[PDB]
Subunit: 208 residues, 6 copies
Amino acid sequence: PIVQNLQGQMVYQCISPRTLNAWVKVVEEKAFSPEVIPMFSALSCGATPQDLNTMLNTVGGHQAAMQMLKETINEEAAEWDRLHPVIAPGQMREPRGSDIAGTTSTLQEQIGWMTHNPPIPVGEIYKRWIILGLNKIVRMYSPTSILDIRQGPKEPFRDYVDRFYKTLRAEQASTETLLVQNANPDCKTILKALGPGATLEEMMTACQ
Amino acid sequence: PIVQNLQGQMVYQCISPRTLNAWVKVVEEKAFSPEVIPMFSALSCGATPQDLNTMLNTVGGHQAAMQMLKETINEEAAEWDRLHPVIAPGQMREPRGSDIAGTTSTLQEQIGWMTHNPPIPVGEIYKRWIILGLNKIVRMYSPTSILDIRQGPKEPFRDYVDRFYKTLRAEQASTETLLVQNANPDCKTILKALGPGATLEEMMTACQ
Amino acid sequence: PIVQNLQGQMVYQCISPRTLNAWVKVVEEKAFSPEVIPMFSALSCGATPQDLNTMLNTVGGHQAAMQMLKETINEEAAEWDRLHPVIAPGQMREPRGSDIAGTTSTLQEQIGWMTHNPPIPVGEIYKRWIILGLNKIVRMYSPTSILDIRQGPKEPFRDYVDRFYKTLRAEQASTETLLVQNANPDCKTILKALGPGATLEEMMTACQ
Amino acid sequence: PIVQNLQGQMVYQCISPRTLNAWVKVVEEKAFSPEVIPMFSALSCGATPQDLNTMLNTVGGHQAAMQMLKETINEEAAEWDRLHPVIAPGQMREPRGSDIAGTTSTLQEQIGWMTHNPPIPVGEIYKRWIILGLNKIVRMYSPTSILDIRQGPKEPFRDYVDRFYKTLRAEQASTETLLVQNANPDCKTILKALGPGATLEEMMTACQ
Amino acid sequence: PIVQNLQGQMVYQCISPRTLNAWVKVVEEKAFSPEVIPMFSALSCGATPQDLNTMLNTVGGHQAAMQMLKETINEEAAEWDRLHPVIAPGQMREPRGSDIAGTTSTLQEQIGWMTHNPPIPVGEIYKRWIILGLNKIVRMYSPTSILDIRQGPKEPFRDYVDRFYKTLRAEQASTETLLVQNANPDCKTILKALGPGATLEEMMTACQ
Amino acid sequence: PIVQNLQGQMVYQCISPRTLNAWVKVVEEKAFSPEVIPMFSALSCGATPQDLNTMLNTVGGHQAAMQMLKETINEEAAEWDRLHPVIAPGQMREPRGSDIAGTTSTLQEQIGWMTHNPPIPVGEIYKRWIILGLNKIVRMYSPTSILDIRQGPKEPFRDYVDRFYKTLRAEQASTETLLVQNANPDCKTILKALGPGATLEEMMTACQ
């Protein structure tokens, strides 16, 4: 990644083994649970396109997902080339979609773009494409419809609400009415009596 | 976070994998036991609003709590906008509530506010809102009333006092009389004989 | 904590996750065995009062002890206010007891005091109060009187001496005669024959 | 490796124990699964030829593979000598193939070449030869032909596609038609009905 | 410890949690096996007397040994005072034995002595006293005489030689003849035939 | 070790606990498997003679090997004294063999030699002697002759070749004919038919 060293200027540093291991392990443990995406974004802070490709390529499993991600990246790269069409000796060339994705650009070129004044943030642009692709995978691999999250007869309301919003997160909605409808008979009666405008805190307190 | 490097000036550094992992693991192990809040505050030292959102978004479970936290944040952001209402080329704009919460502001804007002279400490303001929300969750998820913490017949006084003050911490009180009333017959008699003004040390010594 | 960076001046750095975790884990594993206190002192090297409070507040268990510690701190803070009684624009105010304990002072104020010329070492003063409180807790939670540490018939002298001085450490004495008196018949006879002025090394060699 | 320190210039730093351990452990855990190669490339970022040899030589197992790698390196070194044939006091000599591979060059010579203006990137050249050799080993140790990856009667389509693209990665192809042909009767019928130009996302959605 | 920072001058840094933990763990795992002493010396590189006391005081077990160590330190401190007998405003005082041991000196005084020109190396002097004491403990806790290390009938010569020199290390000798005498009948006959001046390598080869 | 800090000049840094632990653990896990030597070389990068002795002395087991290593070092030190025979106030003395091995030289003297212009690389010279000694130990502790590595009837050729080259590495040869001769009847027939000049890759492919 590009890091502001202990002095000032922005400079390339190798990806740390701790970062590499952290990413490999979170994918192994969590697969494509929604929270893996913010972890990816955090672990790839300041990443060049080369670094982003390193992180994606170190994943051993989930090759269906990684092929789907490649398709999303290729679509975004094509849309870049449509909107931003393009060798002077010693001068910086303009990046194409495949340069942003790191397949046809060098690390030196990537650093050159990212540290230019003004900066051409190829790492951040590529990361956006990757996260777009990862979100699609999270949605596809979401096991259950929100319609099928219903509170059990002996299920604590808190545990039901956890399942409900876990599912909504994976299905990726932009809500409280379905939460009441899918509650068990006893909780539903309590929640109906609260009326409109009740906060989640108030609902959870009422059913505790 | 914003860190004073080995030279002087305040500068942004990415969140370390050790910090990211530490936070995810403490939430996994301790849930919303009261001590998770000081840990959150410590792990988010110098955090920008983006960093705070990263930490909250990397939590996979407890999505009922995370939805309640969003509601608290939205309330605090609205109260900010009421008290602090608000584009000159190249100039710093004033942050709204949604900018403090990192949803409508960029990292560059956040760094700009936090390192201004005088500083507009958007990271610290947002952290206050988050901790307010987390405290509410700790209180809600507290399993037992202090009224129901009573010393067992064969329970060491020390173990009872530990349960008592653990519960008070979770229920969040701003005390010694209820500790005596909820003690077992043998300890209660000893503690009654000590009289008023006895310290906890003296009570624990007397019942040892 | 306040650290001398790789250049010179004293500057604040956040508490590291490794430090935070180390402290939480030692309290979990060792409780209030005497050796936890030097570990606390070492882990809190250069700590501000805010940092010291962070470390104490991250402890989840032992809330009887943490309440006793608060009482000791309040007593020391009151004695500070008696001996050191106390707003000029832009000037440093004098710290009260509650400022030394971090409850009524800001981090910026604490850094200001600690890096003043001459320095007002509020972190070190508070750490002294904390260690005074922790020593009281170690003594209270010491399970056994030194009078009840006696050598078993088949117990190696070395193992007995380990138990003896472990107990003395916890009970906190400022000695060799009781060690002989509490030894088993066979070792006692050997140790009596050595006479006065025998070193612990000589005693342990004689009973090996 | 050669690292840009916190100031500027490129300078040699020893390989960290974390890097050494990371590489040894990934080879132990993953053998020559395809994802080990990007991990190798990432862990050897900025490596001198000496550093690359260190990493390869710390591998205890897989000595058939390491002998095959030596053969590939010797072939690439010979092709270098054919294309780039070659002592002035105090001057930099031109590297031969065996100098690029670190067998006949010193660390000081390697640093001299890598930090020259313009740079003679012996570390990157050698790393290319190594990765060429490792790719050959990955292909050889690939257990299964893509022809033998067929969807089970009760196998989820997602799990089949994972096996399919895992195998293609190991066999190293530069595709969708064989994926349909090797699917089970029920999925094959669904996929045939989608027609030409269907994306992997669309295929996986259709068979979910 | 006192460390030469990334710039130059010698400066105090706190003991790292990794160092603290490393020392506690090696004492827990190895007790007073001889190799713990070089580990102690390595972990306490650049230590002030305060740091050395921290390391010793963090040990929870082995309080017989720690009391014996105190006695050795007191003897060495007394011998210092005999050989080096001893307040000008703002000037450096001469250290006594108790100052070298850190019991009557401050950290600031210790840093002052250690970074003086010429340096008064109180950390190194104290470390010598400690290692002298630790060596005595290693010798005392050595379980077996070298006279009782004899090769078993079916014991590989290599395993016997390992036991032999492990024991000699613990007993602390400043040799080959006893190794032959304590070997089993078959190995003894082979070793006798080699004659005088045989190296350990030659002996081990002959009995392999 | 001597490290080029983040600024420039070469300066001493203490051995890290991570390095110390890494070395102790690799010796515990791998004993004198051949790959331990490159690990030793990597972990001791920039080591002074004192640092090298620290690493060797922290090994608890294998004291037969450590005694053999001492003998090799003494032989190399004697050969140094024969080839390089040898106090001006404030001037650098010439190192003897025992100074290179760190037994009669101080750390300050070692740093002085290693950072001289031109440098007298006592750390690298000593490391060469140590590695010479370690290689002898690896060869001695190699359990099996290459003559006794023969392919089993049902043993995959790859697994046989791994055993074969693992053994050759330990026995330390400077080859393909014995690999064919020691193969099983079925593989031998296939390999004979390939003829002369076949690569290991081609042999392994033919027997797969």
